[PDB]
Point group: D2
Chain length 398, copies 4
């Protein structure tokens, strides 16, 4: 009933990098425009546009989805909503789109996500008294915990994502050598994937204006060919003294956008749209904040169950790489080796980038396209989510 007929993503840029000049609302518009243009489905046919965004305080404020779809030239009739389940917002957007199609409402929906961590603004508290006294803090929304709630600090901590990654490394006994090794592979597969043209179909270039002339960013600037196991081992822990998680075996902060077009099976048939995949089942689940990294475990088991499938039926697995330590802990639960041919075949977030709000849709796009070329029947896309959550979506190729 819910079919994925098109998937697109802008390349992923480094923080303050290649796409730091492009504002989120404009960035997402590029994705939305490109999705529809190559699909051959008039914009006017889209019923509603769901988009994921982790921080809607800056140029992405007041419902990016609606702002972006308008900017992209869609007719005024197309609706939009911005969903926010942090790291997993991108996937939640697709889930939301699918559920609508299943409910027999619209026939054409878009599931997307965007996040410009470079341009994330500062948030400043409002005074509560007349002529205050005392310094104030300007919170950088690019980062994490802010406007902290004392009651929150008391119930669970406010440990950084990086810290929870260490908590996992401890719990599962994931050594530094293994973390860096996992990281090296992410880079190697990504570099190889680009080099061999596997990203050419799903990636749509983004024009950047540098002063007077335009530049065309058309490749993720994250992957490095010179990544070596020696250099990776030279980096210092960054979240815990005498720790194990370093800047090299964890994802960076990035800018990016992704969008997938979903239509009802009947609609696809009536317009000759060739399916890329079909949404089989979705699941969401919560885990303790201190170890939000394993969120994919219970989410994937619930999803597989709902799709009446076994992990072993999966032929391609997209597990978002928030931290090597976290990803490996998840792999432990699944009894899988980082060398598994099905796992992040073209690289993961450690090398490609983790533009929060957009990653969910980003990884589903990479999954679907790869599923098609190697004709895999079942694929999984799942991510860990900040403050203790997980989301997973099971897709069936066609």
């Amino acid at each position: 009933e819910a079919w994925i007929v098109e998937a697109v993503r802008t390349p992923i840029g480094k923080h303050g990098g290649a796409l730091a000049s492009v504002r989120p609302d404009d960035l997402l518009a590029h994705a939305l425009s490109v999705l529809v243009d190559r699909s051959g489905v008039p914009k006017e046919e889209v019923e509603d546009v769901y988009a994921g965004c982790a921080n809607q305080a800056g140029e992405d404020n007041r419902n990016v989805a609606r702002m972006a779809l308008l900017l992209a030239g869609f007719p005024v009739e197309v609706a939009g909503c911005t969903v926010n389940r942090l790291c997993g917002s991108g996937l939640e957007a697709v889930a939301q789109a699918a559920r609508a199609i299943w409910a027999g409402e619209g026939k054409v929906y878009i599931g997307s996500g965007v996040e410009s961590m470079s341009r994330a603004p500062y948030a400043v508290p409002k005074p509560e008294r007349g002529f205050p006294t005392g310094n104030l803090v300007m919170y950088d929304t690019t980062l994490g915990w802010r406007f902290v709630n004392p009651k929150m600090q008391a119930l669970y901590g406010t440990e950084s994502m990086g810290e929870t990654a260490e908590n996992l490394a401890e719990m599962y006994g994931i050594r530094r050598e293994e973390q860096d090794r996992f990281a090296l592979l992410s880079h190697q597969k990504a570099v190889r994937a680009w080099e061999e043209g596997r990203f050419q179909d799903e990636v749509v270039p983004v024009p950047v204006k540098r002063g007077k002339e335009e530049i065309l960013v058309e490749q993720d600037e994250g992957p490095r060919r010179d990544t070596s196991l020696e250099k990776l081992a030279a980096l210092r822990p960054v979240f815990r003294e005498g720790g194990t998680v370093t800047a090299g075996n964890s994802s960076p902060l990035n800018d990016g956008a992704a969008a997938v077009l979903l239509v009802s099976d009947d609609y696809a048939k009536a317009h000759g749209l060739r399916p890329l995949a079909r949404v089989r089942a979705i699941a969401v689940a919560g885990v303790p904040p201190r170890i939000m990294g394993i969120g994919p475990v219970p989410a994937t088991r619930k999803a597989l169950e709902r799709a009446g499938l076994s992990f072993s039926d999966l032929g391609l697995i997209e597990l978002n790489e928030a931290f090597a330590a976290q990803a490996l802990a998840v792999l432990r639960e699944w009894s899988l080796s980082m060398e598994d041919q099905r796992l992040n075949p073209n690289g993961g977030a450690i090398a490609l980038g983790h533009p929060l709000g957009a990653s969910g849709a980003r990884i589903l796009t990479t999954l679907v396209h790869e599923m098609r070329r190697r004709k895999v029947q079942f694929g999984l896309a799942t991510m860990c989510i900040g403050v203790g959550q997980g989301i997973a979506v099971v897709v069936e190729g066609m």
Copy 2:
């Protein structure tokens, strides 16, 4: 299949008023706590929490749903996500919940919303160059357009909600006397509803700490008994010189939170939960930004059609009052009189308050409760949405 077994809301406070000292995440936690406590449904039974929020830049940052549920004592397994479709986010949250139950994922979901416009922080842009020069702006997130996109400015304007209200008053020729008359009714019906105890069931008191001692806020502080038709006419236009929209015939800025508990029919039967109503159909639609006030029209039409009903089958209608002018324009299309006994029976946003993010769930709460007491079969909850959108939900009493 998707049943509404409980609905609650905190009273609505004026800007910088009775609830200005309560932070959004905490406010929403009160609603979430109350919802389950009265239901007799253990927290661990909830599958996911959807919550709407128009501005997630302050104490409501990084997914308030998840933050709120944890603060409210829910176990770590309960998931949560924050939806944002501006003014209509509250309703989008319920729709989201319903579609999940229909998809047969979980059996217990919460659809809610929160908005503390009193504590909305300031947003400051990030520097793009080394040692800048020139003044910067601190955008007040309590208001409207910010970090404006030039392209947006060119395609459609960045007129304020209040201005779009005028555009409608002009388009439909809705006089000032008519608008103020409409506003007077909102107050009278609200004052009456409270006075007669119709809000007693749906409202849960919120404790506010004033220094050392606690005070219990237990009534909306918006409605005023001394509201007169003369006073209303003495106000000056606020959005357009020689205009018609005044601070008196338009909604204010407020703080508030609301939550509705939906459960699958099979679950309700297994646990003896008595249904308040059933979710029949949902519809979302877009309209030109310059007259977003009309959003309810195409959305209500789509929803009714999807529920296979006619406007005349409706026995109670909750049309959020963003502006007298806008509501009346909507009434024009429906060929309904502001005196219709089915319309906002206990008052509307002009007198009660419009805590953005929470309004959707807020009016749904008021609808369901009134539907039950007057044994109405079909009810409609619909609202206009910023930058040109509209959402509507048809519900069947039980």
Copy 3:
């Protein structure tokens, strides 16, 4: 006699966010400047330059308030102006600056003044040093103290708050809690009594405050409290050091206020029939260790007295700014004086009246001069402690 004080005025002192919080510093100072000249009978065009003290010039008091204020007050464009800043003692430095110019034989008419609007002090935000930064920033409240701290500074001397330096002194001189509060109770009583008996009617000039549509006239310091009791004072908890002694009650508050004094050359005074209020005898500035800035008046007063060829015993009126009961008493310890001395802050001190930083210096000088005239005292001393370790003192001879 070369530099003569011929007029002294001050606006009432308001509480933080209080009665004058609505008035901006530049405008407030203008009121003082305008009033000083109006009642003097000396045309504004006669003034040579205007010195003014201001501890924080980041907000509405930016870019030399002196000049802004004077123009606002209707002075002709020819009158010059400069804003001096020696923190807590800026107000007095302003007067000293004026006197020294008159002695140098430059102009014949100068104004020494000060202003401080602690209520409207803005926030200061650092500038980015890199392209697309990352990390939280801080908005420093200029109403307070240490900000944009320099590591090197932190290393050499601390960055202990004024309140803490008060404690350091209470400890060093063993100034008990009962003593401190007793001293504070007196400040209030003398102040309440002085107002009550009209001793402030001459030196104070009412300030019009606009509340919405109508104007209100602020004409009395809102700091002094008749209900101040030794019981209440003792019930307050230390504010700067756990198990300490300095409370919010035995320390000065944060206030808004402005004051200005008109000085002229003696030959000018004689040529225009201006009756002298007093004559500036000697000035002295001195530094002391930051951690106990409170004693600053000590070395400064000895230097000033010596320069005026006088002994402490020749003083018939002493205005010692009350930054903290503990700090004042420590100074009194050095001078071997009792807080009961009839010469000491006869009409109350900052603890009860207020300490609008930049204006305090000129504020106490104004109160000294006026009281010197009514009780016909020959020698008066005005001295204050200054933040980060300094002290200033000015000796004046009545006429």
Copy 4:
């Protein structure tokens, strides 16, 4: 002859966000202060008080930079300090203040300095006056000019920028674009020539800058450019008024820098064998209409010369701060002097060298004194225009 200038030093002048943007003002000024005393052979404990000029004390230069800088520089705790602010002329005002104290027979050793780091000037934010406000706020960049504008001010005189008042002057005196660019070109050539020939080696003291892990030594003003041409200068577009004449090229930039001069009493100099560089003859300050603040030097130079009992023609060396080619030339008109005058800014002016506000006053006095000594001139003049309508001048006699 009671006030003698025995030593003069200045740090090089950096561009906005340039070579010294990493150094904080308080630290920058400490360099000047340390350097001044180290080469004078006068123990720090001998210094009585330290005056410093600073146009914006809202950032790292808050709460009396003089006292912070002197402590940072290692001076003993007893040395006092105060920050004076007369905007563009604060640097000079600091020396004047030092001199006047020596004349009054207070201390024997004083320091007059100035500092300004326009690169790190913070942002200033207003304080809310109501509980839960609504409406956007503004973050004023203290690097610039008018801010927290007073409506009343706007109504009496405008709030025209310095650059604008430079145009008003250009118009009033009919100073053509070609003339302005020519003046600007000479400022660069004389500056480049001066450095190249080593005339700045004596007065300039290197500033160590930390660049990550290693130190770099900034030792030359980074403003002057050898490649400055009359053709390039003419290519620039007006920056303050459409179809105007003032360009970024014929105006001074925004810069960072610090300077300090050591003044001592004549009897002290004699008793310790200090060789005088110059003698402070007379000082004068004056106000002019804000819209044409550029001419401030005229009435101030007149009053100063008159107080020194000299005639303009007796001046053998003239340092007129170059705020704007247009402003400087208008002043030159009043004096009936040609920009070719061999006495005028011999080693270059602000347009090429830089205008680090608060420090420029002391900076130009330093360059004047040193040049006076090498070419054995007897009388020199240092004068500047001051924001919002003022001017200051100081007459010095070589020795």
